[PDB]
């Protein structure tokens, strides 16, 4: 039940996932969820907040 995890997450947004970025400095921010019902999947589909 307890898992120290480590993952690589890919960029899915169409406008930038294949962009060939030329020289320069660029700000790159993204927002990630903490909601277990969104992030995880359960075989029964039970609530995971409860």
């Amino acid at each position: 039940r307890y898992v120290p995890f480590h993952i690589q997450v890919p960029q899915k947004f169409f406008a930038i996932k294949n962009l060939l970025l030329l020289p320069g400095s660029y700000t790159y921010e993204w927002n990630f969820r903490k909601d277990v019902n969104m992030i995880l999947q359960s075989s029964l589909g039970n609530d995971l907040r409860v």
Partner: protein
């Protein structure tokens, strides 16, 4: 150095919905404000006719 090395080795998340039942609704609402006046009207009409005993006994 060897033998075992072949494999590898918070505060508040603040939920809210917990372990209670489901909920439902309907839109046929609120006669009830009229009885609060019915009750206090008819209450006066009691006292009004207690007075009508007294105002006839005093004759």
């Amino acid at each position: 150095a060897a033998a075992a090395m072949t494999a590898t080795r918070m505060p508040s998340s603040g939920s809210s919905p917990s372990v209670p039942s489901s909920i439902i609704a309907e839109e046929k609402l609120l006669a009830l404000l009229a009885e609060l006046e019915a009750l206090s009207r008819q209450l006066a009409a009691l006292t009004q006719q207690v007075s009508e005993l007294r105002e006839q006994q005093q004759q």
